[PDB]
Symmetry: C5
Subunit: 200 residues, 5 copies
Amino acid sequence: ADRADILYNIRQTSRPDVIPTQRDRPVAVSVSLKFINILEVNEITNEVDVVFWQRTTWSDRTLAWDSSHSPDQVSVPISSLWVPDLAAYNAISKPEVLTPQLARVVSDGEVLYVPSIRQRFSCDVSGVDTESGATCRIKIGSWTHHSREISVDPTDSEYFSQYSRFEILDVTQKKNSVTYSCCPEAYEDVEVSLNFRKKG
Amino acid sequence: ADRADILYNIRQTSRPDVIPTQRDRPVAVSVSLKFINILEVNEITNEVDVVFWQRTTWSDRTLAWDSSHSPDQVSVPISSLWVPDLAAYNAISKPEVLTPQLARVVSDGEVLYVPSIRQRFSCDVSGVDTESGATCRIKIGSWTHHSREISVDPTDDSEYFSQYSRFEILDVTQKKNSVTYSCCPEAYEDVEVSLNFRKK
Amino acid sequence: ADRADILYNIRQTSRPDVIPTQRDRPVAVSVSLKFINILEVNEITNEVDVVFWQRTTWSDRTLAWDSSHSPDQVSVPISSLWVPDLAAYNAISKPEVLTPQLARVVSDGEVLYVPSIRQRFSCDVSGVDTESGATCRIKIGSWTHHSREISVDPTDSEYFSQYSRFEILDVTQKKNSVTYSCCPEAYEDVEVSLNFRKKGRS
Amino acid sequence: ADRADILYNIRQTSRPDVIPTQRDRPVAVSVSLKFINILEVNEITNEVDVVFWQRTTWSDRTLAWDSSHSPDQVSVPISSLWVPDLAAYNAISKPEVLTPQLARVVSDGEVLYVPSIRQRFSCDVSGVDTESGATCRIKIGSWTHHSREISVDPSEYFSQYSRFEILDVTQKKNSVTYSCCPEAYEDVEVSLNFRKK
Amino acid sequence: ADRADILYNIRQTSRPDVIPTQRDRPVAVSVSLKFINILEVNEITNEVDVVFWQRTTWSDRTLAWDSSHSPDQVSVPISSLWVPDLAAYNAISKPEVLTPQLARVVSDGEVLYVPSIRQRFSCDVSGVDTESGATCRIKIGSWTHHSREISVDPTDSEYFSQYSRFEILDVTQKKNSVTYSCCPEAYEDVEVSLNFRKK
Ligand SMILES: O=C(/N=c1\ccccn1Cc1ccc(Cl)nc1)C(F)(F)F
Ligand SMILES: O=C(/N=c1\ccccn1Cc1ccc(Cl)nc1)C(F)(F)F
Ligand SMILES: O=C(/N=c1\ccccn1Cc1ccc(Cl)nc1)C(F)(F)F
Ligand SMILES: O=C(/N=c1\ccccn1Cc1ccc(Cl)nc1)C(F)(F)F
Ligand SMILES: O=C(/N=c1\ccccn1Cc1ccc(Cl)nc1)C(F)(F)F
């Protein structure tokens, strides 16, 4: 089988609107942000405009194929796959995806999607012009799938632009969960704590 | 039946362009705003820029399925369902939907859609910098369906409000109301949401 | 017949791409603006940013159905119907439609479409900070259908925001026509004259 | 045949991705700009923001019909037709089409498309505040079709409310050749001479 | 064969979502920028806004045809072809494509795509107001295809606007590769070094 055959079989099997739960097990989604740039910071409005690679992985075992004598990976448009409905709870702009909207699918059904995103957040910008810096917390989880359907798991300056006016002191990525006043269900999130300051 | 079968059945039965009226009853739509952020306020132009969760529910009994031995809820793209044609009568920008455009459909045909919306409004910002604050009224109802076709009913004010806003919420009231246009006798139902807020 | 049947039959019969001319008659389009808000005014550049309800009506007899024992109206997405190709001749931005893009179709084939539009115009803003105010003229007609294919007919503060910095002194809506030096065809328009000023002047 | 029949046959016949060359001839595209407004000018950055009607005509004879006893012209969405791939070589923004994206198709296969475009250009703004004014040159031609495939040939509607006025508009045939390749690309060079009032 | 027959063959054969690899060879993509304009430069934020023609070529030999007695080129919408998933690694805005999204397909299966792009970058703007000027480095390569699937190869003021406030001192285009600390795979790129200054 060649790449054309692998993509045809993915198109025949993939259900982009169906979460690929295995044994009524939650889909385990791994989310990890790599900060690339901090573009605009407003300490009076508590708003930041950031660029980050949102490294996202999960398994869809329905997409698996035998790769003994075939490619074991292909690039696929995300419109052909199920993708987790992740949202940043303190976002104040829609995610601007800067890069081609392609995922990698491995022959075992593992999916990797790493969009470069520019987005604006409401977060604590107090202290940005001090030595100890600001700590801006970004919360990302499923918008519509509670913890029985999607679980979110985490995994500093390595890809950060050396040309930014700002620098990263530390990034922490911690598992958390949100429950709503109405309903029993918990929604999982990753809390990403970006400690940064203006360069001296 | 699995999630795939539920979504296939929704695609076979859903009529996104047909209001799901049962007998000749109006569709009962519940609308409730949770304020998340107040980003900009202009006392001279009487304009506010806000982020809110618009919690919207209704019933479409054509979508119902037997869930004795299947999932009793699924996430569905709103493009596959009928959605009420709600509009904010005093909006001065298009609603910017920040979140994935997915609804939850329950096996009894109940639908929940909770978009996070950033939008700008024309409303009374007088008193915003005083202790008693401003009261900004936002009117949301059906644009094209009168009260025989759609009825709109309302349901801690600060529980999800950003601590990083320059503003704080004193009170939110959500009241039933109706608009009638000069030209005809038909009444359009709305919820009037009164946001009493002030500068910190 | 239920609403589903009416919409299915509209989808079967409606030709969104075909102007519904009856006999060899122009389609009679009624256009009427209700001003809701005046957002930004620049007296140096002569530009205004306004929100208005563009009340639009016409008849498409191909859509008609027997409603003796069925609903006599439905809401329909505009993508399923023919809609007049109206444009503002002095617009300097695309019309931003703020509302659901649904029309009402009555069982006699009458169509009503009332989008809330935010749009920017090049017009006379001189005098906005005077007692007599500015008069900004907006011209709306068919972009591509001349007067033998589409005729445009008209029909003040009732829906204007009380919270605007501006007040409306008067709105007049007058029938007009444009002819191009090139070609014989006359294009009908409505000329909407918005006379407004800043509130609270000395 | 009624309007519905003419539009159905246009939809059945039209090849939006195929240049409608007749014989071995280039498609003859006529382009003429009518300036409506000059909105912003920057003498330091040499940038202008302008509104113009881009009057564009060509022939697609495959669309022709007998109109002895039928309408001679119909409005068609451009997404149903072949349209020349015109670009402004010195544009620094995407063309913003302000008007309904409909062309007129005549029963002989002539096509007319007149979008109202707002667009920003890099051009000579020096002298805008003088009596003799600035001359901003806009070059428009096929991006991907050379002169064997497409040939390009060339104040009444200018807003009285602009803070600028038009002294003169010249529209001259020209061609661009790339150092890489033999192919010549035809263009119209539009010289807009304008000044602050 | 007429143009319609050539395009119908392309539309039937082209697989827009499938990289056209020959055997287990990478697809060899050529990328070359021609700078047209430098519009905004911010020495405090280290941001530039630029317009460039991104000349992009590759081969898809499945598309080839006999042109002895037919056109040897046609214009095709990129939505009907495979196109390399190129991205600028230091971009801070989406690429704004200013031109029609058409590629040329040549009868030997060579494909040429030359979009005019306006885009904003994070790069070194220090020295822009000096005689020696700033050097802004732009990295462009495959976002999702490593060096076994796509190889990227390069190939000065000739098309640069005389009306810019800036002028080009030099452009160098060098082959490079990026590796991620996660995985063995190398991703090929072109590093374009734009040396420019205020006039
Ligand atoms: O982590 C990885 N790739 C990164 C990481 C950061 C930035 C870019 N890429 C390349 C890449 C790989 C796959 C997909 Cl779907 N999208 C992008 C690696 F090595 F796994 F490919
Ligand atoms: O109200 C609820 N969820 C909220 C409330 C506020 C913000 C987010 N969500 C999660 C959510 C659930 C379902 C849908 Cl369709 N959209 C979003 C609850 F609890 F009922 F799920
Ligand atoms: O004019 C009318 N409605 C108005 C007038 C102004 C603003 C809103 N609406 C509601 C409405 C009704 C139907 C359609 Cl298609 N679009 C909007 C009325 F009452 F005649 F329907
Ligand atoms: O300039 C011209 N027409 C204008 C100019 C401005 C506004 C309207 N029209 C009419 C018109 C006719 C046909 C097409 Cl496809 N598009 C528009 C003309 F007629 F010369 F082509
Ligand atoms: O390099 C070339 N053309 C250029 C070079 C720079 C700018 C524009 N064009 C025209 C052109 C040709 C083909 C394609 Cl797909 N897209 C555009 C040439 F001559 F080889 F076609």
